[PDB]
Tab-separated table of N, CA, C and O in Angstrom:
chain	number	residue	atom	x	y	z
A	1	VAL	N	109.788	149.606	101.199
A	1	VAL	CA	109.046	148.448	100.752
A	1	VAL	C	108.892	148.536	99.079
A	1	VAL	O	109.361	147.724	98.369
A	2	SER	N	107.982	149.434	98.788
A	2	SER	CA	107.394	149.288	97.298
A	2	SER	C	107.724	151.029	97.156
A	2	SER	O	107.690	151.778	97.521
A	3	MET	N	107.878	150.677	95.657
A	3	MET	CA	108.719	151.934	94.914
A	3	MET	C	107.371	152.239	93.847
A	3	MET	O	106.514	151.434	93.171
A	4	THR	N	107.082	153.711	93.467
A	4	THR	CA	105.927	154.013	92.785
A	4	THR	C	106.410	153.405	91.286
A	4	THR	O	107.395	153.742	90.570
A	5	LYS	N	105.493	152.620	90.851
A	5	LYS	CA	105.517	151.702	89.748
A	5	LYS	C	104.909	152.610	88.481
A	5	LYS	O	104.113	153.432	88.576
A	6	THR	N	106.206	152.738	87.838
A	6	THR	CA	106.035	153.664	86.619
A	6	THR	C	106.553	152.812	85.330
A	6	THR	O	107.470	152.264	85.028
A	7	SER	N	105.553	153.233	84.606
A	7	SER	CA	105.899	152.302	83.179
A	7	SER	C	105.851	153.606	81.915
A	7	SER	O	104.992	154.335	82.051
A	8	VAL	N	106.701	153.651	81.300
A	8	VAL	CA	107.357	154.421	80.511
A	8	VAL	C	107.183	154.168	78.826
A	8	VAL	O	107.784	152.874	78.368
A	9	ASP	N	106.211	154.635	78.037
A	9	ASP	CA	106.017	154.136	76.874
A	9	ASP	C	107.361	154.852	76.182
A	9	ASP	O	106.880	156.073	75.264
A	10	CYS	N	108.308	154.265	75.689
A	10	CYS	CA	109.209	154.624	74.696
A	10	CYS	C	109.233	154.665	73.156
A	10	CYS	O	109.883	155.423	72.848
A	11	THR	N	108.013	154.227	73.070
A	11	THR	CA	107.322	154.388	71.790
A	11	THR	C	106.983	155.691	71.814
A	11	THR	O	107.164	156.467	70.663
A	12	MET	N	105.966	156.391	72.065
A	12	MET	CA	105.829	157.671	72.167
A	12	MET	C	106.387	158.735	72.934
A	12	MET	O	106.495	159.933	72.634
A	13	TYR	N	107.208	158.275	73.887
A	13	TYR	CA	108.085	158.908	74.767
A	13	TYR	C	109.275	159.666	73.669
A	13	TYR	O	109.706	160.837	73.430
A	14	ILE	N	109.768	158.745	73.089
A	14	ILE	CA	110.639	158.928	71.914
A	14	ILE	C	110.142	159.670	70.770
A	14	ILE	O	110.468	160.645	70.310
A	15	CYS	N	109.025	159.133	69.954
A	15	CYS	CA	108.446	159.381	68.809
A	15	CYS	C	106.976	159.974	69.422
A	15	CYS	O	106.307	158.950	69.183
A	16	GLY	N	106.894	161.069	69.298
A	16	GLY	CA	105.097	161.520	69.778
A	16	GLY	C	104.556	161.657	68.467
A	16	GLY	O	104.777	162.467	67.923
A	17	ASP	N	103.564	160.688	68.235
A	17	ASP	CA	102.750	160.863	66.989
A	17	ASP	C	103.732	161.452	65.479
A	17	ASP	O	103.115	161.794	64.712
A	18	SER	N	104.524	160.249	65.389
A	18	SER	CA	105.467	160.294	64.091
A	18	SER	C	105.732	159.266	63.627
A	18	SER	O	106.178	158.130	64.400
A	19	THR	N	105.341	158.912	62.151
A	19	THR	CA	105.688	157.731	61.623
A	19	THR	C	107.275	157.377	61.322
A	19	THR	O	107.759	156.491	61.628
A	20	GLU	N	107.456	158.507	60.622
A	20	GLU	CA	109.283	158.365	60.287
A	20	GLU	C	110.300	158.243	61.566
A	20	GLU	O	110.929	157.655	61.352
A	21	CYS	N	109.739	158.965	62.758
A	21	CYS	CA	110.458	158.911	64.036
A	21	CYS	C	110.005	157.426	64.083
A	21	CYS	O	111.260	156.915	64.873
A	22	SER	N	109.072	156.889	64.067
A	22	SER	CA	108.882	155.425	64.567
A	22	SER	C	109.519	154.589	64.024
A	22	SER	O	110.364	153.773	64.422
A	23	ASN	N	109.617	154.632	62.607
A	23	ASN	CA	110.910	154.136	61.733
A	23	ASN	C	112.425	154.082	62.288
A	23	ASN	O	113.024	153.149	61.907
A	24	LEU	N	112.516	155.518	62.478
A	24	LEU	CA	113.926	155.418	62.779
A	24	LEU	C	114.283	154.689	63.982
A	24	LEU	O	115.053	154.350	64.403
A	25	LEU	N	113.073	154.721	65.165
A	25	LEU	CA	113.608	154.150	66.417
A	25	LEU	C	113.436	152.429	66.033
A	25	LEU	O	114.081	151.812	66.606
A	26	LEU	N	112.686	151.951	65.243
A	26	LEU	CA	112.780	150.582	64.575
A	26	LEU	C	114.114	150.336	64.089
A	26	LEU	O	114.694	149.252	64.477
A	27	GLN	N	114.761	151.554	63.525
A	27	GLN	CA	116.023	150.788	62.824
A	27	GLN	C	116.901	150.656	63.920
A	27	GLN	O	118.003	149.977	63.681
A	28	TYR	N	116.865	151.274	65.135
A	28	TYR	CA	117.670	151.056	66.361
A	28	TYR	C	117.363	149.377	66.783
A	28	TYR	O	118.335	148.896	67.719
A	29	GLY	N	116.723	148.492	66.339
A	29	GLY	CA	115.851	147.803	66.548
A	29	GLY	C	115.031	147.390	67.885
A	29	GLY	O	114.222	148.070	67.707
A	30	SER	N	115.108	146.817	69.181
A	30	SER	CA	114.337	146.478	69.782
A	30	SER	C	114.579	147.338	71.419
A	30	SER	O	114.344	147.105	72.186
A	31	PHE	N	115.486	148.361	71.156
A	31	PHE	CA	116.189	149.260	72.364
A	31	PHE	C	114.582	149.751	73.385
A	31	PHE	O	114.508	149.654	74.402
A	32	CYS	N	113.860	150.075	72.299
A	32	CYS	CA	112.606	150.511	72.995
A	32	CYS	C	111.809	149.092	73.892
A	32	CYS	O	111.161	149.127	75.312
A	33	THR	N	112.003	148.036	73.211
A	33	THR	CA	111.251	146.545	73.925
A	33	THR	C	112.143	146.786	75.177
A	33	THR	O	111.883	146.026	76.081
A	34	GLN	N	113.487	146.435	75.031
A	34	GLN	CA	114.094	146.328	76.164
A	34	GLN	C	113.802	147.051	77.433
A	34	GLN	O	113.662	146.941	78.552
A	35	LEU	N	113.674	148.453	76.975
A	35	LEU	CA	113.489	149.348	77.984
A	35	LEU	C	111.947	149.087	78.535
A	35	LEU	O	111.895	149.017	80.107
A	36	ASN	N	110.820	148.619	77.613
A	36	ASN	CA	109.641	148.486	78.141
A	36	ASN	C	109.763	147.171	78.959
A	36	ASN	O	109.024	147.294	80.030
A	37	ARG	N	110.317	146.133	78.669
A	37	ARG	CA	110.171	145.034	79.706
A	37	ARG	C	111.194	144.960	80.549
A	37	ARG	O	110.323	144.512	82.035
A	38	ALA	N	112.304	146.095	80.842
A	38	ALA	CA	112.599	146.213	82.280
A	38	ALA	C	111.806	146.991	82.927
A	38	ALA	O	111.666	146.753	84.174
A	39	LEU	N	111.033	147.931	82.569
A	39	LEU	CA	110.265	148.784	83.413
A	39	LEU	C	109.136	147.864	83.771
A	39	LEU	O	108.408	147.991	85.028
A	40	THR	N	108.211	147.054	83.052
A	40	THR	CA	107.675	146.011	83.433
A	40	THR	C	107.880	144.893	84.483
A	40	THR	O	107.446	144.722	85.488
A	41	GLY	N	109.398	144.436	84.456
A	41	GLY	CA	110.027	143.962	85.337
A	41	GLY	C	109.824	144.615	86.591
A	41	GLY	O	109.282	144.360	87.956
A	42	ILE	N	110.462	145.865	86.797
A	42	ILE	CA	110.353	146.773	87.979
A	42	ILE	C	109.060	146.548	88.615
A	42	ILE	O	109.231	146.411	89.919
A	43	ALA	N	108.139	146.566	88.011
A	43	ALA	CA	106.756	146.586	88.208
A	43	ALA	C	106.305	145.427	88.866
A	43	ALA	O	105.981	145.239	90.224
A	44	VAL	N	106.646	144.235	88.415
A	44	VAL	CA	106.129	142.874	88.841
A	44	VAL	C	107.029	142.693	90.151
A	44	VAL	O	106.577	142.090	90.922
A	45	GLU	N	108.646	143.108	89.937
A	45	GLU	CA	109.008	142.301	91.070
A	45	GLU	C	108.756	143.104	92.305
A	45	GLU	O	108.818	142.713	93.597
A	46	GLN	N	108.198	144.337	92.189
A	46	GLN	CA	107.748	145.434	92.982
A	46	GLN	C	106.604	144.878	93.854
A	46	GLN	O	106.531	145.012	95.110
A	47	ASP	N	105.777	144.748	93.012
A	47	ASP	CA	104.289	143.949	93.577
A	47	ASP	C	104.949	142.458	94.131
A	47	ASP	O	104.151	142.513	95.229
A	48	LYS	N	105.483	141.963	93.614
A	48	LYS	CA	106.044	140.574	94.336
A	48	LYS	C	106.431	141.080	95.806
A	48	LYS	O	106.359	140.602	96.800
B	1	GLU	N	92.619	184.667	72.061
B	1	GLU	CA	92.145	184.324	73.096
B	1	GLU	C	92.941	182.994	73.786
B	1	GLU	O	93.532	182.521	72.870
B	2	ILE	N	92.770	182.839	75.083
B	2	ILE	CA	93.553	181.849	75.669
B	2	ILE	C	93.297	180.070	75.442
B	2	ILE	O	92.157	180.203	75.812
B	3	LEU	N	93.967	179.667	74.945
B	3	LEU	CA	93.475	177.950	74.776
B	3	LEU	C	94.103	177.275	75.288
B	3	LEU	O	95.697	177.371	75.276
B	4	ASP	N	93.876	176.164	76.362
B	4	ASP	CA	94.927	174.846	76.354
B	4	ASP	C	95.011	173.831	75.331
B	4	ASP	O	94.454	173.284	74.779
B	5	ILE	N	96.580	173.458	75.670
B	5	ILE	CA	96.539	172.187	74.678
B	5	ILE	C	96.962	170.900	75.765
B	5	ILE	O	97.930	170.934	76.583
B	6	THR	N	96.471	169.525	75.354
B	6	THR	CA	96.530	168.673	76.235
B	6	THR	C	96.570	167.508	75.103
B	6	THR	O	96.117	167.095	74.167
B	7	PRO	N	98.190	166.757	75.217
B	7	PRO	CA	98.373	165.564	74.543
B	7	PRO	C	97.710	164.604	74.578
B	7	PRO	O	96.849	164.116	75.549
B	8	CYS	N	97.052	163.569	73.363
B	8	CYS	CA	96.225	162.512	73.435
B	8	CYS	C	97.075	161.572	73.660
B	8	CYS	O	97.832	161.498	74.586
B	9	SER	N	96.188	160.343	73.677
B	9	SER	CA	96.736	159.131	74.412
B	9	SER	C	97.019	159.005	75.803
B	9	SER	O	98.218	158.497	75.803
B	10	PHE	N	95.973	159.169	76.282
B	10	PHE	CA	95.708	158.996	77.571
B	10	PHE	C	95.893	157.539	78.208
B	10	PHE	O	95.266	156.447	77.630
B	11	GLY	N	96.984	157.077	78.743
B	11	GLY	CA	97.065	155.671	79.489
B	11	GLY	C	97.643	154.701	78.397
B	11	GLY	O	97.956	154.982	77.353
B	12	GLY	N	97.702	153.533	78.701
B	12	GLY	CA	97.877	152.465	77.938
B	12	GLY	C	96.702	151.561	77.604
B	12	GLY	O	95.773	151.927	78.000
B	13	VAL	N	97.379	150.343	77.061
B	13	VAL	CA	96.107	149.302	77.071
B	13	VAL	C	97.205	147.861	77.767
B	13	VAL	O	98.291	147.171	77.259
B	14	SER	N	96.296	146.839	78.190
B	14	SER	CA	96.754	145.530	78.945
B	14	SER	C	95.705	144.534	78.568
B	14	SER	O	94.665	145.076	78.049
B	15	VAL	N	96.222	143.384	78.399
B	15	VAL	CA	95.304	142.246	78.053
B	15	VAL	C	95.551	141.470	78.999
B	15	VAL	O	96.377	140.975	79.819
B	16	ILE	N	93.996	140.610	79.475
B	16	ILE	CA	93.904	139.839	80.280
B	16	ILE	C	93.472	138.715	79.619
B	16	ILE	O	92.408	138.416	79.333
B	17	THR	N	94.037	137.484	79.691
B	17	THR	CA	93.702	136.303	78.826
B	17	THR	C	93.938	134.930	79.991
B	17	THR	O	95.067	135.323	80.426
B	18	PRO	N	93.197	133.896	79.477
B	18	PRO	CA	93.757	132.724	80.576
B	18	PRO	C	94.781	131.823	79.953
B	18	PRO	O	95.191	132.209	78.966
B	19	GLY	N	94.966	130.909	80.384
B	19	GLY	CA	95.853	130.045	79.726
B	19	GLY	C	95.592	129.584	78.398
B	19	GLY	O	94.314	129.582	77.918
B	20	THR	N	96.735	129.464	77.339
B	20	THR	CA	96.008	128.975	75.772
B	20	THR	C	95.320	127.792	76.025
B	20	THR	O	94.579	127.686	75.038
B	21	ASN	N	95.187	126.875	76.482
B	21	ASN	CA	94.568	125.667	76.733
B	21	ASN	C	93.389	126.146	77.536
B	21	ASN	O	92.419	124.858	77.411
B	22	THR	N	92.992	127.065	78.044
B	22	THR	CA	91.907	127.272	78.826
B	22	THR	C	90.751	127.724	77.937
B	22	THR	O	89.935	126.862	77.665
B	23	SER	N	91.132	129.091	77.440
B	23	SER	CA	90.115	129.398	76.213
B	23	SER	C	90.488	130.646	75.809
B	23	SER	O	91.517	131.191	75.867
B	24	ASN	N	89.675	131.306	74.667
B	24	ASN	CA	90.259	132.381	73.951
B	24	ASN	C	89.436	133.754	74.675
B	24	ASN	O	90.196	134.569	74.042
B	25	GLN	N	88.687	133.567	74.957
B	25	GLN	CA	88.236	134.681	75.772
B	25	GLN	C	89.022	135.646	76.402
B	25	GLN	O	90.053	135.245	77.178
B	26	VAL	N	88.996	137.123	76.216
B	26	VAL	CA	89.986	137.915	76.824
B	26	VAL	C	89.384	139.089	77.219
B	26	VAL	O	88.212	139.288	76.873
B	27	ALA	N	90.020	140.117	78.238
B	27	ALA	CA	89.591	141.254	78.744
B	27	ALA	C	90.394	142.357	78.507
B	27	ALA	O	91.520	142.026	79.113
B	28	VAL	N	90.112	143.264	78.413
B	28	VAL	CA	90.918	144.320	78.304
B	28	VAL	C	90.727	145.375	79.167
B	28	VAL	O	89.982	145.782	79.648
B	29	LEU	N	92.213	146.116	79.507
B	29	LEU	CA	92.287	147.130	80.411
B	29	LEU	C	93.176	148.207	80.208
B	29	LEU	O	93.935	148.286	79.330
B	30	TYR	N	92.387	149.630	79.897
B	30	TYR	CA	93.006	150.810	79.899
B	30	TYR	C	93.138	151.484	81.079
B	30	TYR	O	92.483	151.481	81.850
B	31	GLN	N	94.545	151.716	81.471
B	31	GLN	CA	94.997	151.917	82.385
B	31	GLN	C	94.867	153.650	82.626
B	31	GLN	O	94.596	154.569	81.599
B	32	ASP	N	94.625	154.125	84.193
B	32	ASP	CA	94.637	155.556	84.311
B	32	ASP	C	93.552	156.464	83.179
B	32	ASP	O	93.819	157.314	83.108
B	33	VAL	N	92.346	155.319	82.653
B	33	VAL	CA	91.592	156.536	82.072
B	33	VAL	C	90.562	155.911	81.962
B	33	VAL	O	90.219	154.766	82.637
B	34	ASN	N	89.005	157.092	82.116
B	34	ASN	CA	87.909	156.285	82.275
B	34	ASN	C	87.540	155.613	80.907
B	34	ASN	O	87.729	155.959	79.811
B	35	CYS	N	86.281	154.915	80.876
B	35	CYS	CA	85.821	154.621	79.757
B	35	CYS	C	85.115	155.301	79.103
B	35	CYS	O	83.891	155.801	79.608
B	36	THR	N	85.754	155.678	78.142
B	36	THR	CA	85.113	156.672	77.190
B	36	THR	C	84.673	156.099	75.595
B	36	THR	O	83.612	156.370	75.239
B	37	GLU	N	85.618	155.186	75.086
B	37	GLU	CA	85.383	154.746	73.844
B	37	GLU	C	84.580	153.481	74.019
B	37	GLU	O	83.611	153.310	73.358
B	38	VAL	N	84.566	152.363	74.502
B	38	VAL	CA	84.297	151.198	74.821
B	38	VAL	C	83.472	150.890	73.632
B	38	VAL	O	83.917	150.990	72.676
């Protein structure tokens, strides 16, 4: 029925405490944002 | 001597807010972490 709700911080997962790495991640656009919203989805419809 | 290393940034942060037309008051939530900074 329910799956273990997992939220993954692609900002720190990809770039842990790095500013230049964070800028490089931002250069890719919003991919981190799509990942975050997809996981928040998984969580919300799992709760539903 | 043997020392342990633990990465920082425990958990995340969430925002609890009512409707924009209701009020400006907010409540913050720190996931899977005890109240340390406050």
